[PDB]
């Protein structure tokens, strides 16, 4: 049979970012509504007479069904940032 794509169940999120030239405390992640925002900023000064900076931003829409409070971030020692989320649970309306 032909090769097929394996479907993914809904309600999950997973992305990776290469932020190796930002330190852990130069990077922040937050959820705003149903988006995730990543921000990073580095500045250095070689002397009093100058200033070098980098900046990065990105926003992702969380897919349907994701719990916006269940987003996690993990920054590897090699500077890869994983951002993941899992499905929201639904309140029951009938007895168990």
- In angstroms, the Cα distances linking 42 to 25, 45, 47 are 9, 10, 16
Residues 79, 57 contacting (CB under 8 angstroms)? no
Q: Provide the resolution (angstroms).
A: 1.1
CA-nearest of 63, 41, 73, 64 to 54 is: 41
Q: How far apart are CA 17 and CA 75, in angstroms?
A: 9
Q: How far apart are CA 93 and CA 96, in angstroms?
A: 9
Residues near 75 by beta carbon (within 8 Å), at least 6 away in sequence: 19, 24, 27, 81, 82
CATH topology of domain 12-88: Immunoglobulin-like (2.60.40)
> How was this model experimentally determined?
X-ray
Joined together, the tokens standing for residue 25 give 């405390």
């Amino acid at each position: 049979g032909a090769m097929a794509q394996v479907p993914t169940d809904p309600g999950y999120f997973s992305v990776l970012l290469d932020v190796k030239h930002f330190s852990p405390e130069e990077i922040s992640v937050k959820v705003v509504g149903d988006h995730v925002e990543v921000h990073a900023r580095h500045e250095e000064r070689p002397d009093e007479h100058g200033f070098i900076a980098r900046e990065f931003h990105r926003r992702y829409r969380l897919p349907p069904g994701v719990d916006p409070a269940a987003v996690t971030s993990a920054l590897s020692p090699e500077g890869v940032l994983s951002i993941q989320a899992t499905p929201a649970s639904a309140q029951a309306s009938l007895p168990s």
